[PDB]
User: Fold human melanoma growth stimulatory activity from Homo sapiens.
Amino acid sequence: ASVATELRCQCLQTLQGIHPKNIQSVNVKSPGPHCAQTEVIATLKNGRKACLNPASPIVKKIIEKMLNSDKS
Amino acid sequence: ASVATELRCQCLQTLQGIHPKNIQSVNVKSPGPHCAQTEVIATLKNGRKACLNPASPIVKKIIEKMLNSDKS
Assistant:
């Protein structure tokens, strides 16, 4: 465990746009307390959560794609 | 209370992009059970939640703007 500026937050280690199938939702929150960092947790299908890098391009997709999800 | 196809979900009545200041985060989930509808809950600063219409244009902003939040 390294001394980073993010304790309150739950982010794993911001993945770079993983694959969904399990990923059923995501949460995005602004900074504030000592974590003073954004929030981008994708809730897994099993009811878990992961964080991804919205600053990342592929990951910025993760938001948009999670937002899409049409009938196909 | 009308008989709609969304009980499981918590959505208030999907607002059309309200103003933040309180809105500190949001959650987006896919359909599945009898709710069989998306999910777009903006968690309020007081720790509350609201739903908005991501299909809506202004509201699709609510996602992108909530995603932005820079130093300014």
